[PDB]
Design a protein around this nucleic acid. Structure first.
Ligand SMILES: [Mg+2]
Lengths: 241, 662, 453
RNA sequence: AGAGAAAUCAAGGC
RNA sequence: GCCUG
């Protein structure tokens, strides 16, 4: 039933697209790359300056037209039903009274961050040293990754993980098999149904090992390069495992 | 100032960061830029000849002069053709691996460049609406104009875009047809040429370290493809040239040169300086000649040379935007009048005046050809008597001489100065300082002392939330402080203090510090503060500047399973969707603030809906660049049919769904 | 024709303002000629900056600096403290400057009264026309139009050169005076590693060093005033808004530094200037230092204070920048930390309770001073520079970094050589016009020796 | 008035 | 006289 409802909604959206945007619908598909970044807002150069005013507005947050959030709670007006508008207290209220998702979803979302936290807390630190140490910056891997996957094959790996049936066989043989297998294993529960926008980013952060210029008193492994921001500062050197 | 000059414990070089008064407001340019633009336009003509003859210099098409005309006691505004050719040949012969990498880039990477990247540029002056519009809007308008006039579909590649731009120039006339309002505008060939060659000039705002304000210039979208191609080639060649500081971070090469030493017998010297009137003393013809020499010696075909030379030639016939006009005062009143209405210090240019733009041949403008200017400066160094280590970034430069005697060092420094003049670059005599023996200097805000290169930022990190949302703002601020810490600027104490200040500002910005609506609401409902933006104590530390707030709190036990389930619930209604990565998890606190010509906002909303439907229906465009043979309609129809026909629903339900499709 | 082709018409268009074809093929034999160069002279002695001559530079900052004071009030809310101050007040004019007429005091009191009822926003009555320059642009334009005669001339702008005022030294001296309580209160970060502990200890020691100074109090006052004015910048846009500067002492007693009013501002751009009627408590009044302020005598509980009114106009960007004024603490901190971290590196043992001797070119017989005093003075000078940051300061510092590097090179007996016709002092001097802090820095530079053997 | 510095704000458009 | 900020 859910699939049928989603397909009906997609058909309604197709009607809206073909009826309201006949001119845009006839442009080249690659033209997407041009108008996916379409934006009339200028480069503000100072959103932090307007943040204070925006937060203190009567209805700063824009929320989807949901029904779980009551219109009025303990006298406070939580939402403005005409996407509807809601005040900054809504996220705080949701943190106490709100719908609860499965623990599997929570584990999947936090997989990268939880792994980073465990990696930080799963290692010991040696006696901190002090001296005239020269921190010659070098380009090293930023964060440890699931498996060694070439940057060229990263998009193919993501495609195989998410929608393997929409890619060519030659492309199917351009992605790491272990990485795709385990990423599909850990990203399966609910991250791979509709919340693809964040799931793809999490997967990329898991497999994509971006190189960065970091200070290295000694040769740095990705595990150390993750936390190199405090291992050495030209005046000290903390030795890890 | 005597306080900033220690003679014990630490050295004055360490106190250099004290001379940076960035904590105060940055200067902002006011009102008209016509005076600055006109001064920039006139400087090359004044400096072309030793005697400031402007009328005679204004008649020069290509600015080239013999060495006798080159000014040694002042700036020069021209180049020597034979010297440019010889220096380009020497540069090609010296850095052959870089030339081979450039050849590979041309033969492989260049054809695959998509013009969609042009949407990532700065503000562009649209020649259709006669207004400044963002890069995506100008690019879409230009592509539509090309499609309408050429009666063909522009290819996804950038070379196809350049070919279309060249083709539309042949037509005698062009036409463009665009709340609801229909309007058709017709341009002549000369009008389109003027729009293509016209530059848009604007004040450079919030620039520090300068007493006098200066302007920057940007080209029109018509010529942005060629400029992008040339700049990409320049970046590719520069990334493999040891003498450069733009793409390699700058600090690495300066540190490498600092680490170098000698046999404590050879005379060493360190010349650090800038170039005076760098952009007002370069001729585009010199750069195009250098590029032609590079390509010709590379064996490239004729069309490549034509493509690389077109942008420089179009820049030669530039129509700089004067702006609002010059200011005149009849006592206490003030009026703004364009050049040529009343006598002024720039009367010599009244001849080269158009409706509101001034035609200029000699000189350039800052912010348009940076990598090409760097290459022009670098080819000069490739002499037979310049055995030293030179690093140049656009304008700043540092040269390490290692000679056998002081007289040889002076001769080499003078040879460097004269060669830079030869190409058309004048090192500022006042801002150029040579220190012997070497071991002290500055370059690109990085100060080198003996064997230590300390990086000093032009501005301290903005210890304020960006303005997106609590989680994203916290992650971005922590990442910025971490980047400042690991780049050598901030140490343990400075980093921790900056984090404390940022935490205070971040808590204040989100109404979680004193008695506010958020805190009062949380207290009245017994909502225990669990996150930093909620008023809870800062869980982050100096070591844990990279861990996520939610993950760290969960590990420490500050967040329980039920709270995490309620927060990270993907069904909550308050979340939707280079060196600024954001690794914050999509929690309920990752919301968006409601931020709130009429014929363009509707188009933007329509495109937003189209891209949203594509994203939900095409679960492949978020992983790879969009690509499919055909238009949007064909691909969307195929994908929708495949999705619907692959479902497990019964035949009747499938037919019901399909029938509703328009 | 292969991949890219240029038509004949476009070729002719391109070959319009150049001497070569689309592919330049100049017919010249490539070689590098020899040009008669010049001699590279040596900077035997460091230069001396130009000390301007003119009227002493007044205090042109937004709020008061070292002279700022506060009134102690019983613990309570800002409304309670404002009501307590207003109820017991005998404000009377003492020195009325034509720039800030004394009548404008009526605006301040009417605001305080309005703040004692719980409504900071107040409506204009009579005195806001001159207090905030309402409809002043039209008046100036009409006056200029009615007095128009002559011929248009290229507008000439001149910056009135001024000399070093004698109050910069006094401000520097009074800014580093010790206080009773700590004025820097920042929530500490969590500690999970020895590195975190060391960083927190260093930050705590720095705050202890610079926390109990007058400069810290002035920084807190500036931060509070800027934050409260910037926050209430679009509250009403048509009525006078009250933004009192009130702090809480550890005992809980309120401290009233002053009062900032916002006029009926009509702000469109981010660089526009909104009017203000800053009213602040002084400690000592000098006519030559505050020629535009108007000083009144305010009596509270028998005690007497001076209240200075100024008619200012400040931009949104400047208010936002001064809201985050705490960043001024970052620059000195590093210099302190490095010194500490310099002592730990030479013996592989950290020591937070270390303040070695820093030698300096001091006017008196003193050879130098201690790390704590030097850091306090650095914080004071950096705060003054930040307050007085304008294009003159930017250019002066940018062009004085070169001379600082040259001085450091001379200190190590490194010969500094210069090109032909080079005058870095010429670049530095053009930035010395009015800025009193720039003049103070130039005097300090001139004080130090210019010859090193 | 005032802010400010090489030209603007001290409200603009229709 | 109407309206944005
Ligand atoms: Mg330099």
């Amino acid at each position: 039933a859910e699939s049928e409802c989603t397909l009906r909604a997609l058909v309604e959206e197709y009607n809206g697209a073909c009826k309201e945007a006949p001119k845009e619908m006839s442009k080249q598909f690659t033209d997407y790359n041009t108008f996916k970044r379409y934006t009339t807002s200028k480069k503000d150069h100072a959103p932090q300056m307007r943040l204070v005013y925006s937060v203190r507005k009567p209805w700063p947050i824009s929320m989807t037209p949901s029904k779980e959030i009551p219109l009025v709670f303990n006298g406070t007006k939580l939402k403005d039903t005409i996407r509807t508008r809601a005040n900054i207290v809504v996220p705080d209220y949701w943190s106490k009274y709100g719908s609860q998702t499965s623990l599997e979803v929570v584990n999947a979302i936090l997989y990268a961050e939880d792994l980073k936290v465990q990696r930080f807390f799963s290692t010991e630190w040696g006696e901190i040293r002090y001296g005239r140490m020269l921190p010659f910056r070098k380009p090293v891997q930023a964060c440890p990754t699931i498996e060694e996957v070439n940057p060229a094959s990263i998009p193919h790996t993501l495609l195989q993980v998410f929608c393997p049936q929409y890619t060519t066989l030659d492309s199917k043989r351009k992605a790491h098999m272990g990485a795709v297998e385990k990423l599909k294993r850990v990203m399966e529960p609910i991250c791979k149904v509709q919340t693809q926008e964040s799931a793809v980013h999490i997967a990329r952060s898991l497999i994509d090992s971006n190189k960065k210029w970091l200070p290295t008193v000694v040769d740095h492994t990705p595990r150390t390069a993750e936390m190199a921001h405090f291992l050495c500062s030209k005046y000290h050197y903390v030795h890890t495992n | 100032m005597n306080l900033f000059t220690p003679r014990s414990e630490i050295n004055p070089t360490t106190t250099q960061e004290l001379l940076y008064a960035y904590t105060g407001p940055a200067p902002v340019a006011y009102g008209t830029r016509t005076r600055a633009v006109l001064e920039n336009i006139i400087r090359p003509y004044q400096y072309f000849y030793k005697e400031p003859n402007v009328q005679r210099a204004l008649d020069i098409k290509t600015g080239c002069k013999e060495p006798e005309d080159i000014n040694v006691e002042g700036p020069s505004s021209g180049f020597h053709t034979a010297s440019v050719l010889k220096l380009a040949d020497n540069f090609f012969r010296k850095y052959r691996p870089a030339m081979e990498k450039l050849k590979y880039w041309i033969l492989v990477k260049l054809p695959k460049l998509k013009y969609a990247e042009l949407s990532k540029g700065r503000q562009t002056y649209s020649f259709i609406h006669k207004r400044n519009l963002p890069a995506p809007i100008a690019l879409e308008e230009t592509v539509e104009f090309l499609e309408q006039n050429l009666r063909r579909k522009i290819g996804p590649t950038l070379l196809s875009y350049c070919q279309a731009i060249a083709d539309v120039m042949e037509l005698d006339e062009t036409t463009y047809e665009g709340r609801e309002e229909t309007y058709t505008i017709k341009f002549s060939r000369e009008e389109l040429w003027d729009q293509m060659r016209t530059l848009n000039t604007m004040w450079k705002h919030l620039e520090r370290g300068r007493l006098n304000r200066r302007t920057i210039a940007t080209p029109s979208m018509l010529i942005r493809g060629f400029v992008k191609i040339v700049e990409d080639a320049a970046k590719e060649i520069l990334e493999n040239v040891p003498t450069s500081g733009v793409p390699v971070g700058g600090e690495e090469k300066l540190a490498k040169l600092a680490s170098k030493q000698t046999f404590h017998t050879a005379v060493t010297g360190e010349l650090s300086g800038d170039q005076e009137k760098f952009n007002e003393c370069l001729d585009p013809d010199a750069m195009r000649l250098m590029w032609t020499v590079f390509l010709r010696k590379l064996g490239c075909p004729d069309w490549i040379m034509e493509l690389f030379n077109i942008p420089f030639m179009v820049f030669k016939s530039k129509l700089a935007d004067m702006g609002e006009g010059l200011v005149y005062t009849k006592g206490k009143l003030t009026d703004r009048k364009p050049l040529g209405e009343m006598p002024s210090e720039f009367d010599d240019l009244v001849r080269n005046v158009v409706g509101n733009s001034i035609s200029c041949r000699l000189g350039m403008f800052m912010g348009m050809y940076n990598l090409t200017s760097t290459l022009l400066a670098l080819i000069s160094i490739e002499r037979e008597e310049l055995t030293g280590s030179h690093v140049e970034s656009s304008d700043d430069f540092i040269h390490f001489f290692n000679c056998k005697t002081h007289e040889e060092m002076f001769k080499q420094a003078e040879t460097l100065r004269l060669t830079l003049k030869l190409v058309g670059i004048n090192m500022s005599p006042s801002k150029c300082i040579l220190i012997s023996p070497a071991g002290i200097g500055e370059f690109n805000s990085k100060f080198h002392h003996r064997d230590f290169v300390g990086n000093v930022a032009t501005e301290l990190p903005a210890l304020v939330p960006n303005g997106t949302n609590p989680m994203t703002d916290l992650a971005m601020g922590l990442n910025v402080i971490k980047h400042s810490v690991n780049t050598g600027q901030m140490n343990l104490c400075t980093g921790a203090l900056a984090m404390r200040i940022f935490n205070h500002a971040y808590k204040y910005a989100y109404m979680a510090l004193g008695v506010t609506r958020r805190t009062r609401f949380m207290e009245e409902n017994a909502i225990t503060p669990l996150l930093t933006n909620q008023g809870a104590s800062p869980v982050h530390s100096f070591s844990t500047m990279h861990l996520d707030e939610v993950a760290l709190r969960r590990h420490l036990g500050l967040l329980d399973e039920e709270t995490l389930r309620r927060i990270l619930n993907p069904n909550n209604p308050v979340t939707q969707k280079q060196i600024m990565e954001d690794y914050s998890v999509p929690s309920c606190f990752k919301y968006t603030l409601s931020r709130n010509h009429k014929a363009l906002l509707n188009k933007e909303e329509r495109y937003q809906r189209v891209t949203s439907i594509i994203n939900k229906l095409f679960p492949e465009v978020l992983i790879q660049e969009a690509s499919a043979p055909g238009t949007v309609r064909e691909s969307l129809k195929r994908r929708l049919e495949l999705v619907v026909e692959r479902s497990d629903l019964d035949e009747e339900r499938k037919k019901r769904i399909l029938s509703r499709i328009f | 024709k292969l991949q890219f082709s240029v038509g004949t018409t476009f070729r002719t268009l391109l070959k319009r303002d150049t001497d070569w074809d689309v592919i330049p093929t100049p017919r010249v034999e490539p070689n590098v000629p020899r040009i008669e160069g010049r001699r590279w002279t040596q900077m035997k002695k460091l230069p001396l900056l130009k000390e301007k001559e003119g009227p002493p530079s007044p205090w042109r900052a937004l709020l008061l600096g070292a002279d700022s004071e506060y009134i102690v009030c019983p613990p309570g809310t800002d409304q309670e403290a404002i009501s307590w101050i207003h109820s017991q007040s005998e404000i009377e004019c003492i020195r009325e400057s034509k720039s800030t007429p004394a009548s404008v005091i009526t605006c301040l009191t009417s605001s305080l009264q309005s703040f004692a009822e719980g409504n900071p926003v107040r409506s204009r009555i009579h005195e806001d026309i001159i207090a905030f320059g309402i409809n002043k642009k039209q008046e100036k334009k009409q006056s200029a139009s009615s007095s128009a005669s002559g011929e248009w001339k290229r507008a000439e702008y001149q910056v009135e050169e001024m000399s070093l005022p004698p109050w910069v030294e006094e401000e520097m001296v009074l800014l580093r005076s010790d206080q009773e309580d700590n004025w820097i209160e920042l929530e500490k970060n969590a500690i999970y590693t020895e590195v975190d502990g060391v960083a927190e200890g260093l930050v705590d020691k720095y705050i202890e060093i610079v926390g109990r100074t007058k400069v810290a109090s002035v920084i807190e006052k500036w931060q509070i005033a800027a934050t409260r004015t910037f926050s209430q910048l679009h509250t009403d846009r048509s009525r006078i808004t009250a933004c009192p500067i009130i702090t809480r002492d550890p005992s809980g007693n309120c401290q009233f530094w002053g009062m900032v009013l916002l006029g009926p501002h009509h702000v469109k751009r981010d660089t526009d200037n909104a009017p203000l009627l800053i009213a602040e408590i002084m400690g000592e009044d000098t006519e030559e230092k505050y020629p535009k302020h108007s000083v009144f005598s305010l009596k509270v509980e028998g005690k007497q204070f001076l209240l200075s009114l100024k008619i200012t106009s400040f931009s949104r960007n400047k208010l936002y920048t001064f809201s985050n004024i705490r960043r001024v603490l970052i620059q000195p901190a590093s210099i302190y930390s490095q010194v500490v971290l310099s002592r730990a590196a030479e013996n592989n043992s950290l020591n937070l309770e270390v303040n070695p001797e820093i030698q300096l070119y001091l006017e008196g017989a003193q050879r130098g001073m201690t790390l704590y005093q030097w850091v306090r003075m650095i914080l004071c000078l950096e705060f003054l520079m930040a307050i007085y940051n304008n294009p003159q300061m930017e250019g002066f510092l940018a062009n004085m970094r070169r001379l600082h590097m040259s001085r450091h090179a001379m200190m190590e007996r490194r010969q500094v050589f210069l090109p032909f016709g080079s005058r870095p002092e010429d670049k530095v001097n053009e930035c010395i016009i009015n800025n009193p802090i720039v003049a103070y820095l130039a005097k300090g530079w001139n004080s130090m020796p210019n010859v090193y053997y």
